[PDB]
Amino acid sequence: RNVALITGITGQDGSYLAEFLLEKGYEVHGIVRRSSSFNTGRIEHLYKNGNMKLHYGDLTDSTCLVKIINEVKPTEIYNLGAQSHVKISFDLAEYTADVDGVGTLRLLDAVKTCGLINSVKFYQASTDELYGKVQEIPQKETTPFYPRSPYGAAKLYAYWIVVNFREAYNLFAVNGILFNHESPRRGANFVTRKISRSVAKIYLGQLECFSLGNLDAKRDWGHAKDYVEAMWLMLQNDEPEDFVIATGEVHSVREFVEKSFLHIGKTIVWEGKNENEVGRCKETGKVHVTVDLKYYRPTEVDFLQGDCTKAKQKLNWKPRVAFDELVREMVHADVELMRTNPNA
Amino acid sequence: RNVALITGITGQDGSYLAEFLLEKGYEVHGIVRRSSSFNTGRIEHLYKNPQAHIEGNMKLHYGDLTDSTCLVKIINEVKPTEIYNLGAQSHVKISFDLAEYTADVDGVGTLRLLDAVKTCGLINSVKFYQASTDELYGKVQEIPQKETTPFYPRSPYGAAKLYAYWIVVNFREAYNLFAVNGILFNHESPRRGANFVTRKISRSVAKIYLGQLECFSLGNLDAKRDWGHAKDYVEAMWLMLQNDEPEDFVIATGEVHSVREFVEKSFLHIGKTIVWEGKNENEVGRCKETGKVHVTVDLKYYRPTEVDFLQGDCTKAKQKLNWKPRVAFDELVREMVHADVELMRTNPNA
Amino acid sequence: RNVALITGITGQDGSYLAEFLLEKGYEVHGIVRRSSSFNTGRIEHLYKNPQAHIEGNMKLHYGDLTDSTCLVKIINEVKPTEIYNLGAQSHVKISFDLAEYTADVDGVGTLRLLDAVKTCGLINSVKFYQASTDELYGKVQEIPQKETTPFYPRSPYGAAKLYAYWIVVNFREAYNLFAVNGILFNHESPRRGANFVTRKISRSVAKIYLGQLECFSLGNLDAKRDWGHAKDYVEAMWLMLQNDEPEDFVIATGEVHSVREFVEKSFLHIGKTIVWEGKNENEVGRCKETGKVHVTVDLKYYRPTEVDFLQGDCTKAKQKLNWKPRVAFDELVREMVHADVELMRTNPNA
Amino acid sequence: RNVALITGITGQDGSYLAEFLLEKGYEVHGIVRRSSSFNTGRIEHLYKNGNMKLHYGDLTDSTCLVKIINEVKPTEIYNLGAQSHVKISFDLAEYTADVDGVGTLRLLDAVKTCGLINSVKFYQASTDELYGKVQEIPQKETTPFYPRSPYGAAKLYAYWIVVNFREAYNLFAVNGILFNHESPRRGANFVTRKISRSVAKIYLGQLECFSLGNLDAKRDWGHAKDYVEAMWLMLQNDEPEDFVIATGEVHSVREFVEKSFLHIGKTIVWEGKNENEVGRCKETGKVHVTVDLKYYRPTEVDFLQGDCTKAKQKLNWKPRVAFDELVREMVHADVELMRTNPNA
Ligand SMILES: Nc1nc2c(ncn2[C@@H]2O[C@H](COP(=O)(O)OP(=O)(O)O[C@H]3O[C@H](CO)[C@@H](O)[C@H](O)[C@@H]3O)[C@@H](O)[C@H]2O)c(=O)[nH]1
Ligand SMILES: Nc1nc2c(ncn2[C@@H]2O[C@H](COP(=O)(O)OP(=O)(O)O[C@H]3O[C@H](CO)[C@@H](O)[C@H](O)[C@@H]3O)[C@@H](O)[C@H]2O)c(=O)[nH]1
Ligand SMILES: Nc1nc2c(ncn2[C@@H]2O[C@H](COP(=O)(O)OP(=O)(O)O[C@H]3O[C@H](CO)[C@@H](O)[C@H](O)[C@@H]3O)[C@@H](O)[C@H]2O)c(=O)[nH]1
Ligand SMILES: Nc1nc2c(ncn2[C@@H]2O[C@H](COP(=O)(O)OP(=O)(O)O[C@H]3O[C@H](CO)[C@@H](O)[C@H](O)[C@@H]3O)[C@@H](O)[C@H]2O)c(=O)[nH]1
């Protein structure tokens, strides 16, 4: 008997996690938010218009969480639901605390209230944003935390409330400290999908210029379809441990723009400084990228690089998709997307 | 100088309200929730390929009716002359399973918004519309219902809206804030949410016409509603704020029809005649011309309670606002069904 | 088997309710807030040096009406047969400055508590009393007020209590939960909170008698209330739960008196006769025998709104519960004033 | 112009902080909770039945915080209000998160909403509970955190949201990482005041036995009347920095019981093990102390010892009251308390 309950099933990781578990025969349950429109576009192809059952819920409604967990009696819980955009968190700090911080507590409390403490396995979606102003290079499980945003602080709270439940009630509960993972389902608001969509529409004559913030930030980028599997591996372990999941390669936002444009035939050369910097196509002389301070963050995370030695040894997990292939896939997918539908 | 703040601008009423105010030259601001997907489909046409008139006149801000700081920051930065509080969890069945959330957004949320106005010192310079609902009448106390018939809610949705109604009135009487309640009966349109009975029928009848679906099920077929067109009703919201004094108004059509009748007429626009067979939960609707059964009953679309004899008397609105509904039941069904065929023909999702 | 869960057990009504149920052999549980000081003064005598009867029959638990988990855990562990929801922010003036908090505790909090009962599967085995209030009548719609006169709240306190009233009724009608609203008019006692008009007068008149104070100030002297004794009224709460069927009841005295009259009579028990001089905010009350002025008016004890002609008709309670009030206005003043002299004589703080 | 706003003014530290600032001429404002009874017993002697003004409020009511801070326009803010009992936090984790965690954010947000970011100085009451399972001995400002309770996790959130406001908006805001501080006004529920009150009533014939939990925990105990002053010193500094405040001496709960009883003439000798351990008076053979598991904590903080070298150098602050004098003062004060009033 394998029954999984996924929060934030409509997001990126949730949609891949649902396919993965479904393929392994699991019965998959998910908590979706009421919306005045449709909000299930990533998972609607899993209906068989079956083995996946959706329930209305919210990480701020204590009664609904108890009702669902008692009705479903899951054997695995994945808490992926959250307000996940670091920038939006600066102007939405209260809601972000209520959902990302207190919401993790509400869910753990529901497991204890239903009496499933000893029969459930609980995965928390932690994040490299805990390292913020990094205290070691690279970052591993033992590196001291130092968050840099209202989103970082909420997740830091969520990390330790999970540790506290494991240590105090022997709940099998783990923190997945995953670094950036992207995909053709990545939200349009994140820098990698913002670039890939923009470059794609430029190549099709649907757009001429788009604006970014800090070009000089460096990220460790992996593929979300690999990292979901590491979440499952963590709950198959014999002891509940915490793990870092990352690629170990570093690249700049600048490089990501360059490689993306390269896949449409254009070579970017930069001119100017700071918020007056621009990106011009060497071949046409057309300007396609400008900078605007409204995409900067009051306190930035400058450099991130994960060391997943522990996960490689204890889980036999390794990433299969590298930086270059990631850019090629996203740019290519958004071309086919925007070619058949320019409103996408 | 006319600048509007709209909560719930992505929903049915808000999108039509945005269009209405932008056409009159207003500057329109809306609050939208952060989402892991696009959630602006209803208003996308206004800031993508808009008319030369009203090109840069709509601005959107991330917020939530449970986040007190973000409301203060938006209201203070926008400094509006009119506020329309249309944001809410609006499904009546879902409120039975989501009662606490529905209370925090529909009830306390109204109070958070008024408190923001008082905090920013705009009490005397802003005009405030509250989205009330015939659901306040629950167990109806008069037939028909008018502004003075006493309330009696029958759901967590009604109770929350009942709190919002009285908190809005209190700010009016205590602080002389210009604040009105729109007591609106059911209103639909081609943009209605798929989870509401009318759009559920119209979308399925469409998909049956194109060979994309065979059969769908409803709950209580003998339920009756007072049904108007949302595009007409947003106009009454604006009139209520143009009134010399803040008063509450019922907005309705005064004609009542059954969901069973809605189904029959919908199928008529697709060439099919329904005859009902069977009783109770085994009742089914079959097509006369093909013999194929297209409508079944499923007990899970009932609700713990039910709202009885709704019929609006908007005499007051006729006199003091000179407003009357322009669209009738027949045309509402006709328009909705036609619209969903054209939509589902070009794309089989939604 | 009779076990009670009381929210707000440290306040006036709860302490007297604890005494009443313990005397009948009930097992009594209460929810108390964490505090940086002692906050159990009203019920301390019940678990410190108690009578041989009812020695180990009261247990206290840390909780809060905004903490959903703690309510579930307490209700599940106690498994009560009767629940009395008396916890609330109960000051009407303070609710104008504390409206959001008052909404979360007085309105949403009632819903959290009922939801706990449904979550624990006790819907069919528990009996639920809700502390309603004549404040629901706000702008009174009938004189006197009875169970059927329509509501019209005038404060954030009233609005919140108005939400709690209807959410309790909804659980009754939707799920057949045994749930009642006690519509109680003002009730006082030697344990009333110092911030309420009666105890404010009685405590100051005492301190003036002992040379500990010279003068105090009130707000609206011409306000009128319907005033009963809390010890009588807790008894009506219990009767409402003993009824064969769940019904709502008004509980009041039906006689109305003014705060001005309350002051005059209070001073009479201390040997002093008041004569009023001056008008409006410059009105003062002077002692006839000494010439010394003891009562002044201060505009800051008014409220943004005011509640008008309160008078309870509890005919229904007389018939179906056989309950009548035992204490009258004269004895209430007499008892309160006497009690505060004895208290302030032995200790000059409170 | 010196105007201070203190949250949790009715608590221990608040009452001493109010005297301290009042003596320096400050205008002192405080936020008190509505109570059905009196809750101002620690500060009521500061009325002059003046320079101290109380306002109704709560760290969970966003509108009331803005109204107060705008009305008062303080130059110094001390956020001392919180649900402060570690044990109670295990069964009150949600309320404790809302107040101790999110409440700190609500107050910072109010400062930004009123436009006082550049004209206010903000003190956060942090705590040695951040060190929990200590990662170094002794603990200093740079020691990695590891909280051990729902109270620890909420404060860890509050620490970093304060750091984020300082780094992102240049708010003069500091974390006081204060270790245990006791006094005759210490809450009755904490181990030091529980002991001193109990020993006192035993010496007066009002009590025979009382129950404790883990006797073998070790704490760094200082006097609250010293530590309030360090809070003021931190806001007189030229740069907003974080500081540890502690004594550097360690002692067990066991020792604290022994010394306390010594000051009434009784010598305690222990018998038994674990939850069957008892404390008997060598002179009379009467048992006065027993152990009960309901005072244990699911995850304990075993050893705590502060190193306030940074505060000594940069603030010229040092503790004036040592462990022994602290016990003598508390026991003596509760004797005089209970002698003149046995209900105290
Ligand atoms: N979004 C965005 N970021 C920009 C832009 N211009 C520059 N950036 C920079 O691009 C970097 C990466 O930004 P995002 O893709 O927004 O993500 P993130 O801050 O690294 O957040 C993601 O990573 C964590 C680990 O997966 C997640 O925890 C988090 O939820 C989120 O998915 C940041 O340094 C940001 O400043 C822009 O226009 N938009
Ligand atoms: N949604 C739905 N309703 C069904 C179904 N079968 C029967 N019904 C009945 O159809 C009627 C109308 O439901 P909606 O049209 O679903 O809701 P309302 O309960 O009519 O709610 C609308 O009215 C209020 C005021 O007009 C609004 O407050 C609310 O947000 C919403 O717009 C109700 O009697 C309901 O029982 C079904 O499959 N789905
Ligand atoms: N508290 C107070 N009230 C004053 C004062 N001067 C005049 N009043 C008037 O005295 C009347 C009674 O006030 P409380 O007795 O202060 O309040 P209520 O507003 O009467 O509230 C009580 O009644 C409700 C139902 O009986 C309860 O819901 C509420 O909790 C409380 O017990 C009101 O008309 C108030 O304006 C003053 O100095 N203080
Ligand atoms: N309270 C209590 N503690 C007991 C008992 N028996 C043993 N202890 C142990 O005594 C130690 C100290 O307990 P407390 O005095 O309750 O305080 P604390 O957990 O150290 O908490 C205080 O210290 C922090 C730093 O000042 C503060 O942050 C926190 O709010 C609180 O004031 C803990 O290890 C606790 O397990 C008992 O009966 N009661």
C108 to B103: CB separation less than 8 angstroms, yes or no: yes
Alpha helix segments (H runs only) across B176-307: 197-209, 230-242, 259-268
Nearest to A105 by CA among A52, A171, A197, A34: A171
DSSP β-ladder status, D210-212 and D121-127? unpaired
- Judge contact between B297 and B217, C-beta under 8 A: yes
Amino acid at B186: N
Q: What are phi and psi of A257, to 5 degrees?
A: -65, -40
Tell me, using a 6 A CB cutoff, whether residue A29 lines ligand 1.
no
Q: Which atom of ligand 1 is nearest to the CA of A82?
A: 30
Locate A222 and state its tokens. 């992996």
Locate B36 and state its tokens. 């892991």
Locate D251 and state its tokens. 């002692």
Tell me how far apart the alpha carbons of residues C13 and C230 are, in angstroms, rounded to a whole number. Answer: 6
- Judge contact between B104 and A128, C-beta under 8 A: no
D290 is catalytic: no
E-only strand ranges, A224-313: 243-245, 251-252, 268-271, 278-281, 287-291
DSSP state of A101: I
Pocket test of ligand 2: the residue of B110, B196, B234 to mutate, having most ligand atoms within 8 Å of its CB, is B196
In degrees, to the nearest 5, what angle opens at C-alpha C344 toward C-alphas C342 and C347? Answer: 110
Nearest to C110 by CA among A341, A121, B100, B96: B100
Tell me how far apart the alpha carbons of residues D172 and D165 are, in angstroms, rounded to a whole number. Answer: 9
Tell me how far apart the alpha carbons of residues D298 and B70 are, in angstroms, rounded to a whole number. Answer: 38
- Which residue is associated with the tokens 């719930």? B8
Mutation to test the D interface, candidates C10, C13, C16, C37, most D Cβ within 10 Å: C37
What is the number of the ligand closest to the CA of A213?
Answer: 1
Tell me how far apart the alpha carbons of residues A67 and A44 are, in angstroms, rounded to a whole number. Answer: 24
Secondary structure element (H or E) that encloses residue C259, with its range: helix C259-268
Tell me how far apart the alpha carbons of residues D339 and D344 are, in angstroms, rounded to a whole number. Answer: 9
Domains located in chain D, CATH noted = 1-186+222-249+301-321 (3.40.50.720), 187-221+250-300+322-344 (3.90.25.10)
Alpha helix segments (H runs only) across D73-149: 86-90, 93-96, 103-113
Tell me, using a 6 A CB cutoff, whether residue A197 lines ligand 1.
no
Say if C300 is an interface residue toward chain D (CB within 8 Å): no
Tell me how far apart the alpha carbons of residues B12 and B193 are, in angstroms, rounded to a whole number. Answer: 7
Phi-psi region of A272 (alpha: psi -120 to 50; beta: other; left: phi over 0): left
Neighbouring C-alpha atoms within 13 Å toward the C-beta of C13: 27
Strand ordering across the sheet containing D76-79? D52-56, D27-32, D3-7, D76-79, D121-127, D172-178, D243-245
> How far lies A116's CA from each of A80, A109, A229, C70, in Å?
20, 10, 24, 17
- Residues in chain B, overall count: 350
- Residues in chain C, overall count: 350
Give the closest-approach CA distance of B145 to chain A in angstroms: 28
- Judge contact between B323 and B329, C-beta under 8 A: no
- Judge contact between A13 and A181, C-beta under 8 A: yes
- What's the alpha-carbon Rg for chain D, to the nearest Å? 21
Tell me how far apart the alpha carbons of residues C108 and C114 are, in angstroms, rounded to a whole number. Answer: 10
Mutation to test the C interface, candidates D37, D84, D189, most C Cβ within 10 Å: D37
- Which string of b and e fits C141-162 if b means at least 16 CB within 10 Å? eeebbeeebbbbbbbbbbbbbb
The CA dihedral of C180, C185, C191, C193, to the nearest 10 degrees, is: 110
- Judge contact between B92 and B155, C-beta under 8 A: yes
Tell me how far apart the alpha carbons of residues D287 and D280 are, in angstroms, rounded to a whole number. Answer: 4
E-only strand ranges, chain C: 3-7, 27-32, 58-62, 82-85, 127-133, 178-184, 187-188, 216-218, 224-226, 228-229, 249-251, 256-258, 274-277, 284-287, 293-297
Say if D151 is an interface residue toward chain A (CB within 8 Å): no
Mutation to test the C interface, candidates D10, D34, D36, most C Cβ within 10 Å: D36
Q: Tell me the helices (H) and strands (E) count for chain A, helix number first.
A: 11, 15
> How far lies B75's CA from each of B24, B117, B237, B273, D245, in Å?
22, 7, 20, 53, 42
- Judge contact between C249 and C183, C-beta under 8 A: yes
Locate C221 and state its tokens. 């002297």
Annotated binding site of B: 8-13, 33-36, 64-65, 86-90, 101, 161, 187, 192
> How far lies D181's CA from each of C106, C154, D246, in Å?
36, 47, 8
Contacts of A161 in chain D (CB under 8 A): 93, 150, 153
CB atoms under 10 Å from CB of B146, counted, come to 15
Q: Which atom of ligand 2 is nearest to the CA of B303?
A: 36
**C-alpha B107 chain-centroid distance:** 17
Tell me how far apart the alpha carbons of residues C73 and C76 are, in angstroms, rounded to a whole number. Answer: 5
Phi-psi region of B138 (alpha: psi -120 to 50; beta: other; left: phi over 0): left
Neighbouring C-alpha atoms within 13 Å toward the C-beta of B122: 22
Tell me how far apart the alpha carbons of residues D98 and C27 are, in angstroms, rounded to a whole number. Answer: 32
Locate C203 and state its tokens. 């405590």
Q: Subunits that touch chain D (at least 3 Cβ pairs < 8 angstroms)? A: A, B, C
Locate B151 and state its tokens. 């309330």
B350 to A84: CB separation less than 8 angstroms, yes or no: no
Tell me how far apart the alpha carbons of residues D258 and D271 are, in angstroms, rounded to a whole number. Answer: 14
**C-alpha A80 chain-centroid distance:** 9
C47 is catalytic: no
- Judge contact between D13 and D125, C-beta under 8 A: yes
Tell me, using a 6 A CB cutoff, whether residue A84 lines ligand 1.
yes
A106: helix, strand or coil: helix
DSSP β-ladder status, C293-297 and C284-287? antiparallel
DSSP state of C350: -
DSSP β-ladder status, B293-297 and C3-7? unpaired
Strand partners, C216: C295
How far is the first Cα of chain D from the last one, in angstroms, to the nearest whole number? 40
Q: What are phi and psi of D233, to 5 degrees?
A: -55, -40
Nearest to C35 by CA among D195, D187, D54, D36: D187
Nearest to D149 by CA among D101, D183, D189: D101
CA of residue C225 to ligand 3 center, whole Å: 9
CB atoms under 10 Å from CB of D290, counted, come to 15
**C-alpha C195 chain-centroid distance:** 12
In degrees, to the nearest 5, what angle opens at C-alpha A168 toward C-alphas A314 and A121? Answer: 50
What is the number of the ligand closest to the CA of A254?
Answer: 1
What is the number of the ligand closest to the CA of A194?
Answer: 1
- Judge contact between D223 and D183, C-beta under 8 A: yes
Secondary structure element (H or E) that encloses residue B82, with its range: strand B82-85
- Judge contact between C89 and C95, C-beta under 8 A: yes
Strand partners, D175: D124
In sequence order, which residues have a C-beta less than 8 Å from that of residue D66 and are 6 or more positions away? B72, B119, D110, D113, D114
Nearest to B320 by CA among B248, B254, B252: B248
- Residues in chain D, overall count: 344
Locate D181 and state its tokens. 């501080």
Tell me how far apart the alpha carbons of residues B253 and B227 are, in angstroms, rounded to a whole number. Answer: 7
B159 to C166: CB separation less than 8 angstroms, yes or no: yes
Nearest to D145 by CA among D11, D50, D242: D242
Tell me how far apart the alpha carbons of residues B108 and B71 are, in angstroms, rounded to a whole number. Answer: 13
Secondary structure element (H or E) that encloses residue A3, with its range: strand A3-7
Strand partners, C30: C6, C60
Tell me how far apart the alpha carbons of residues C246 and C172 are, in angstroms, rounded to a whole number. Answer: 8
User: Sign of dihedral through CA atoms A295, A298, A304, A310?
Assistant: negative
Among A12, A58, A92, whose Cβ lies nearest the Cβ of B101? A58
- Determined by X-ray
Q: What are phi and psi of C337, to 5 degrees?
A: -60, -50
Give the closest-approach CA distance of A145 to chain D in angstroms: 8
Say if C261 is an interface residue toward chain D (CB within 8 Å): no
Tell me how far apart the alpha carbons of residues B185 and B254 are, in angstroms, rounded to a whole number. Answer: 9
Contacts 24+ apart (CB under 8 A), C73-77: C73/A113, C73/D91, C74/C5, C74/C29, C74/C31, C75/C5, C75/C116, C75/C117, C75/C120, C75/C122, C76/A113, C76/C116, C76/C120
- Judge contact between D289 and D253, C-beta under 8 A: no
Give, to the nearest 10 degrees, the angle between helix C156-175 and helix C109-119: 20
C225: helix, strand or coil: strand
DSSP B22-62: HHTT-EEEEEE---SS---TTTGGGTSS--STTSS-EEEEE
Locate C199 and state its tokens. 């105890």
DSSP A20-52: HHHHTT-EEEEEE---SS---TTTGGGS----E
Using CB atoms within 10 A of its CB, is residue A210 exposed (0-12), middle (13-18) or buried (19+)?
middle
Interrupted backbone of chain D, residues before each interruption (C–N > 2.5 Å): 49
D95 to C38: CB separation less than 8 angstroms, yes or no: no
Say if D58 is an interface residue toward chain B (CB within 8 Å): no
Nearest to B327 by CA among B226, B250, B238, B253: B253
In sequence order, which residues have a C-beta less than 8 Å from that of residue C278 and are 6 or more positions away? C284
Tell me how far apart the alpha carbons of residues C166 and C151 are, in angstroms, rounded to a whole number. Answer: 11
Tell me how far apart the alpha carbons of residues B349 and A47 are, in angstroms, rounded to a whole number. Answer: 13
Locate D332 and state its tokens. 């003596």
Nearest to B104 by CA among B64, B134, B62: B64
Q: Which atom of ligand 3 is nearest to the CA of C134?
A: 25
Nearest to B234 by CA among B10, B7, B6, B14: B14
D122: helix, strand or coil: strand
In degrees, to the nearest 5, what angle opens at C-alpha D233 toward C-alphas D229 and D237? Answer: 175
Tell me how far apart the alpha carbons of residues C235 and C251 are, in angstroms, rounded to a whole number. Answer: 11
Tell me how far apart the alpha carbons of residues A113 and C73 are, in angstroms, rounded to a whole number. Answer: 7
Tell me how far apart the alpha carbons of residues A148 and C218 are, in angstroms, rounded to a whole number. Answer: 52
A254 annotated as a binding-site residue: no
- Judge contact between B78 and B50, C-beta under 8 A: no
CB atoms under 10 Å from CB of B342, counted, come to 10
User: Sign of dihedral through CA atoms B241, B245, B248, B251?
Assistant: negative
C35 to D38: CB separation less than 8 angstroms, yes or no: no
Locate D338 and state its tokens. 């209970």
Tell me how far apart the alpha carbons of residues A72 and D69 are, in angstroms, rounded to a whole number. Answer: 47
CB atoms under 10 Å from CB of C273, counted, come to 12
> How far lies B107's CA from each of B163, B176, B212, D67, D71, in Å?
6, 21, 41, 22, 28
Tell me which residue has its CA closest to atom 12 in ligand 2.
B197
> How far lies C249's CA from each of C238, C242, C302, C312, D53, in Å?
12, 13, 30, 10, 42
